Design a protein around this ligand. Structure first.
Ligand SMILES: Nc1nc2c(CCNCC3CCCCC3)c3[nH]c(NCCc4ccccc4)nc3cc2c(=O)[nH]1
Ligand SMILES: Nc1nc2c(CCNCC3CCCCC3)c3[nH]c(NCCc4ccccc4)nc3cc2c(=O)[nH]1
Ligand SMILES: [Zn+2]
Ligand SMILES: [Zn+2]
Lengths: 344, 344
């Protein structure tokens, strides 16, 4: 396969479905990208750079070998997580990480899809602040680009995505898209959302923001989201998603179903013999009832949380497959409406 | 198959290997019986009788259906766990559970191998106290027997095991064996060990205690134990084991290997690319290194503990298979010696 190729096989309104081809494999879009601790998984740049360290992961053969995953891997650039989990900023980078070091770390980890090093602007932000932040991220984008291109193994085998900022402002989203397109990336992420703004506002921003990106490249919405977030985002032309929700939910007793999320610890499930979800083809739903998973989690059994997690991961992939088929078949708008009618 | 049949296919010194046949399946001996939350798994009588309650498990179709396990299930009688996790005693039973109620609960859960309701005498115990306790357990054994026989579905489809007490005293172990044999059970457990006495003392007690049980019935050593405990116990004529160690170890960072247990969190494993154990055929060892499992557990990832747990469960079953084959082949005493040389 090539280093990177994106082909759109079908469209419905703003929604698209197709494929990304890379040397380690094909990614069907729209795609959900789960954390690896699916066609592609997410590595944890921030964590790995601290434990065991990027150099050590390299010494150990790279993330593919480390995690026993030979398919594509995406890494974020780390600053999001530094700012929210670690901080002193400068034009150079963040002390607590610069574009160049971020790209180097992602190279050492060996990821296939590399994210430029950006600043996820805080919400809410004034126009001036949003602009200043966005402008810095675009200088950091060019630095990221240059750093990525300077490493031949990286430039020839991986792909680099640019990240749009601009907060909730249309003119800044536009300038950002402009700067990113001028530099040129393999793909474009919509950053700076899922920062506290709420779904209506996120959708409003996506309505004008996603058409500003190159149509012939994938669009990645970072950190999004609930099942209903994803459907609405795909309606607005997003192709790729990542979110910790399915795995965090699963650790905390929450399961996603076609009828909405459920809290399995609640006593109403203690004698419920139906599977987690009635339609779900996942292994968990093939074998065990809500009553047993309830039992395990209430008892503090690690098995219960693992079963919940597997189910949620599978639910998310089933959702994306249903989105892909419906777009392909020209019935995505009906699916969306049917989905929401039942989910809510 | 029949309700219950035990056949010994080969012997080596005191050690035996063979099979238990029951309606839900065959159990190869010597057998390790893991907790189900293998040819047979253990249900958790004490927990289940409290949550969701035995009657409710019955309403839900019995433990086989609840846990999605159609093979034999063993249940303990609950008093061990009441005394150590819950208490007022009487000849009637324990307030915090009597022989009759214990047997009823085990019936409601639908287990295939039912344990009589006994008292695991505390360690250390004086001869007088050990005797008084043992004598009560033997009256409770007869009550258990009668209760089990009174329920036709139980008496025709399940099996009942008697439990020897007597602490560390030979004469009391003998009287206990005598009373149990007089009542008559499908199998005989050696109770009242793994109570703080240490391996040398446990082996010393097994040396005289196991030959006192009927040779033509299975011998179950309750709550035992580490890999080296099991090998020594099989040397002394034990056929069945249960122990929380593999699952608790796995939750706490400890893995069993042919070279002894290891604490995977230790920094020495952070760059160790060997699997958990080099010989282990388990799925975990087929795919992931010590370095990654180290990483997961240090990060608090539930996946790491699940992988450790699966490995330990598999290690234990590999141990039992190696014990069975060597006894069958007449080389168990060499295996034992080779095992200990490397394990320690
Ligand atoms: N460069 C960059 N990253 C962002 C991220 C991280 C995406 N997930 C990375 C992934 C790497 C592996 C470890 C896990 C994270 C975001 N996450 C969110 N929302 C989360 C909101 C949320 C939703 C559910 C639960 C918690 C938080 N907004 C984000 C905006 C940006 C952004 O502008 N730039
Ligand atoms: N009737 C009865 N039960 C006993 C038990 C419970 C066996 N495991 C049940 C199983 C049911 C499902 C939940 C888990 C337990 C014992 N466990 C131990 N040693 C444990 C010593 C130990 C070893 C490693 C870790 C913790 C404790 N000695 C025991 C003696 C007796 C006894 O005389 N009578
Ligand atoms: Zn499922
Ligand atoms: Zn293994």
């Amino acid at each position: 396969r090539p280093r990177f190729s994106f082909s759109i096989a079908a469209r419905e309104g703003k929604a698209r479905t197709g494929t990304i081809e890379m040397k380690r494999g094909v990614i069907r879009t729209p795609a959900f990208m789960p954390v690896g601790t699916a066609d592609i998984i997410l590595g944890n740049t921030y964590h790995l750079m601290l434990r065991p360290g990027a150099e050590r992961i390299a010494k150990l053969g790279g993330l593919h070998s480390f995690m026993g995953w030979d398919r594509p891997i995406l890494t974020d650039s780390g600053g999001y997580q530094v700012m929210s989990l670690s901080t002193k900023q400068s034009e150079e980078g963040v002390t607590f990480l610069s574009p160049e070091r971020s790209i180097e770390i992602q190279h050492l980890l060996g990821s296939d899809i590399v994210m430029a090093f950006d600043e996820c602007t805080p919400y809410p932000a004034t126009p001036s602040r949003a602009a200043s932040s966005m402008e810095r991220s675009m200088r950091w984008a060019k630095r990221s680009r240059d750093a990525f291109d300077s490493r031949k193994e990286q430039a020839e085998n991986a792909a680099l995505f640019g990240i749009q900022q601009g907060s909730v402002f249309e003119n800044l989203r536009q300038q950002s898209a402009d700067a990113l397109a001028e530099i040129g990336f393999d793909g474009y992420a919509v950053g700076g959302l899922a920062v506290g703004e709420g779904q209506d506002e996120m959708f409003r921003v996506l309505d004008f923001s996603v058409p500003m990106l190159p149509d012939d490249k994938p669009h990645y919405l970072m950190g999004v989201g609930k099942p209903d977030d994803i459907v609405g985002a795909v309606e607005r032309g997003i192709d790729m998603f990542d979110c910790v929700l399915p795995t965090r939910s699963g650790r905390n007793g929450q399961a996603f179903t076609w009828d909405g999320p459920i809290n399995i610890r609640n006593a109403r499930f203690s004698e419920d013999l139906k599977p987690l979800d009635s339609e779900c083809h996942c292994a968990v739903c093939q074998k065990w009832s809500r009553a047993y998973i309830h039992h395990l989690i209430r008892a503090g059994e690690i098995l219960g949380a693992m079963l919940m997690t597997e189910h949620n991961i599978a639910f998310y992939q089933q959702l994306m497959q249903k989105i892909r088929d419906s777009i392909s078949e020209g019935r995505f708008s009906q699916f969306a409406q049917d989905f929401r009618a039942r989910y809510f």
